[PDB]
Amino acid sequence: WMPGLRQQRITVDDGVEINAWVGGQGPALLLVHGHPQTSAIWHRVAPRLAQQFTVVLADLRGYGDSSRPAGDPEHVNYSKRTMARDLLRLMARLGHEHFSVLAHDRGARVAHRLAMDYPASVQRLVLLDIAPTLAMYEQTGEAFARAYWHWFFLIQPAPLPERLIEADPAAYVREIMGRRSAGLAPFDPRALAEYQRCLALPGSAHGMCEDYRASAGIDLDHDREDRQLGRRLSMPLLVLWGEEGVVHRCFDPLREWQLVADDVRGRPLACGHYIAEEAPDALLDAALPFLLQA
Amino acid sequence: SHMHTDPWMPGLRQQRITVDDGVEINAWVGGQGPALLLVHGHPQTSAIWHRVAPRLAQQFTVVLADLRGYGDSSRPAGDPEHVNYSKRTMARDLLRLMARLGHEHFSVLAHDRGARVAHRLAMDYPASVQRLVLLDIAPTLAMYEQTGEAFARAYWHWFFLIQPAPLPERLIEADPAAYVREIMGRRSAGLAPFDPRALAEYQRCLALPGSAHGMCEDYRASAGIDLDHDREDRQLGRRLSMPLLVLWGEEGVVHRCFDPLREWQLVADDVRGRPLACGHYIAEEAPDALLDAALPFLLQ
Numbered sequence A: 001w002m003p004g005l006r007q008q009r010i011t012v013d014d015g016v017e018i019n020a021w022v023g024g025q026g027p028a029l030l031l032v033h034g035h036p037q038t039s040a041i042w043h044r045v046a047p048r049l050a051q052q053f054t055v056v057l058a059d060l061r062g063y064g065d066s067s068r069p070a071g072d073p074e075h076v077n078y079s080k081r082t083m084a085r086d087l088l089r090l091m092a093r094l095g096h097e098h099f100s101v102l103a104h105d106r107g108a109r110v111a112h113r114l115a116m117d118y119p120a121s122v123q124r125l126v127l128l129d130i131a132p133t134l135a136m137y138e139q140t141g142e143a144f145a146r147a148y149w150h151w152f153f154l155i156q157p158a159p160l161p162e163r164l165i166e167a168d169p170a171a172y173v174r175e176i177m178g179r180r181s182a183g184l185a186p187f188d189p190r191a192l193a194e195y196q197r198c199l200a201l202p203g204s205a206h207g208m209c210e211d212y213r214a215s216a217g218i219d220l221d222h223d224r225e226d227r228q229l230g231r232r233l234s235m236p237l238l239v240l241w242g243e244e245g246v247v248h249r250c251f252d253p254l255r256e257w258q259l260v261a262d263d264v265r266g267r268p269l270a271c272g273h274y275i276a277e278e279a280p281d282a283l284l285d286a287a288l289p290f291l292l293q294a
Numbered sequence B: 001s002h003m004h005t006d007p008w009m010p011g012l013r014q015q016r017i018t019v020d021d022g023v024e025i026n027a028w029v030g031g032q033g034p035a036l037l038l039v040h041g042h043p044q045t046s047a048i049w050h051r052v053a054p055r056l057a058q059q060f061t062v063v064l065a066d067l068r069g070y071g072d073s074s075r076p077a078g079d080p081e082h083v084n085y086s087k088r089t090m091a092r093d094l095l096r097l098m099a100r101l102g103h104e105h106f107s108v109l110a111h112d113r114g115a116r117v118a119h120r121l122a123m124d125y126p127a128s129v130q131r132l133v134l135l136d137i138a139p140t141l142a143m144y145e146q147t148g149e150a151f152a153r154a155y156w157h158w159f160f161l162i163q164p165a166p167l168p169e170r171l172i173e174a175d176p177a178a179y180v181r182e183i184m185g186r187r188s189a190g191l192a193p194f195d196p197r198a199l200a201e202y203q204r205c206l207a208l209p210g211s212a213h214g215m216c217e218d219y220r221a222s223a224g225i226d227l228d229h230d231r232e233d234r235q236l237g238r239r240l241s242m243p244l245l246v247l248w249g250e251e252g253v254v255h256r257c258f259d260p261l262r263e264w265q266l267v268a269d270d271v272r273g274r275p276l277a278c279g280h281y282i283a284e285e286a287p288d289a290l291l292d293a294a295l296p297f298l299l300q
Helices: A039-044 A046-050 A080-093 A106-117 A133-138 A142-147 A160-167 A169-178 A189-199 A204-215 A218-229 A246-250 A253-260 A280-293 B046-051 B087-100 B113-124 B140-145 B149-154 B167-174 B176-185 B196-206 B211-222 B225-235 B253-257 B260-267 B287-299
Strands: A006-013 A016-024 A028-032 A054-058 A099-104 A122-128 A237-242 A264-269 B013-020 B023-031 B035-039 B061-065 B106-111 B129-135 B244-249 B271-276
Touching: A006 A080, A016 A039, A016 A046, A016 A080, A028 A046, A028 A080, A028 A106, A039 A046, A039 A054, A039 A189, A046 A054, A046 A280, A054 A080, A080 A106, A080 A204, A080 A218, A099 A106, A099 A280, A106 A122, A106 A218, A122 A280, A133 A218, A133 A253, A142 A246, A160 A169, A160 A204, A160 B167, A160 B176, A169 A189, A189 A204, A204 A218, A237 A246, A237 A253, A237 A280, A253 A264, A264 A280, B013 B087, B023 B046, B023 B087, B035 B087, B035 B113, B046 B061, B046 B196, B061 B087, B087 B113, B087 B211, B087 B225, B106 B113, B106 B287, B113 B129, B113 B225, B129 B287, B140 B225, B140 B260, B149 B253, B167 B176, B167 B211, B176 B196, B196 B211, B211 B225, B244 B253, B244 B260, B244 B287, B260 B271, B271 B287
Parallel strands: A028 A054, A028 A099, A099 A122, A122 A237, A237 A264, B035 B061, B035 B106, B106 B129, B129 B244, B244 B271
Antiparallel strands: A006 A016, A016 A054, B013 B023, B023 B061
16 A cells, blocks of 8 residues: 555645655656545555656645645635645645646646646646536536536535535445446445545535535636636646546547647546546556656 | 415315325315316425415315325335336326316416426326416426536536435435525525425425435436436427416526526417516415416416
């Protein structure tokens, strides 16, 4: 489990600490998970990556063992701008002013904003099973709303979605993850246990829901401003999504990324949403060449 | 408008009628004149009609029915295909209810889930339904087919309550009173527009054991088998033959996200309708406007 990596906490905001697993050697590589998971998602690929990169597997705020800050009416505290600043400062305090990013689900969205807000810090970008949040909400149809129901449940005003999550957090993890195409088969027991332990920490439900609420509000304002002003990702971008997942069925991922990024390459993989755990070898085959030419 | 002093169901008596095997329908029956079935929706009960029923009972024999899974009616088990709470089954419930009360031909005033039941009822038994008034709905099939960002944001439950058990049930049963308060109150005036007795009824009845699963089964059917039946009607060119009046709230989601009159014209041959200056809960927010618009239609 995480051979060669040691867990570290770095204060990134006033009363906000980010928990991360740091190890390896070489150029810096920030690994960012999504919902409802933690840095543990990277346990199958992190050893290999650590042979040529200094890997930093970060737990987003509200997730894992990081701080669980309070929400706020406009959802600034869990905006992608704020969470991206969390990760920028994390890498800075660990001595990495320039780094690559490998990200999944919520993390990838954070990474997107990070790469727009601080382009000089992000060398390369690899985003897993996402299309841009703004396009995904704008292009919502019946199929997407049925499958990604949480994108419309978790954004509802507190305390509703929190009631659901906290009534039975372990059941929440199991139903969110096992009702997708691959079921619960691809998840290592230790990893599932981590997701459930961390999801149960106090304040987690509200933090996750605040992330979603911002991504249905203020985050879309920031993304729309970028769109209207012609501001796009400048650095090399690799986008990988699961052929068996909702993103593949309901959107044109590569097209959507070409609209908001200038140097984009990507393709589907023979798996579902949870790429790093369902298809770690395919993920590495597709991403190591790209991240190593950086 | 609503006052603690207003009468509660004056002239009506509560009745339980067996309409299916182990399924009884609770209903308030009263009045004089031609028969009129009143059908509520979610997350409420027959109590929703308490503002308009005293007046209506002056010219109709009114039957305010509690849907199965709702109010004081039975809460039968679900099933993998969601037949037990399909709109076909609930419509047959109401047909049999009116039959056992001695009414083979009747008019219908219905809201929300009840209106959807009414749609199916009027399609499956057109000779029994004389006139139809449907409140703040467009047809379920068009509403799902035309889902966009705004609709999914506003009618989030249409995509939460349909998820496989036990998830939405967990939400509802963790705090049923909060579910009612949050579902109904999310607007500028909150729960003020609902008479205290009516809100108390909705909360008491939703808290009865088995309620969450029944309501979720209704929604699941409306995202599955019900849509099979409705698409079959559309493909075969079967439409509502009797007069249809559709009234929806100008301030509600249906108005914002669809063209209700057009959508009903696609599935009915004799339709008229218009928005009212209120939200979703027409019968409680604007009882006088509701009656002004509907009594002429129901009396012809």
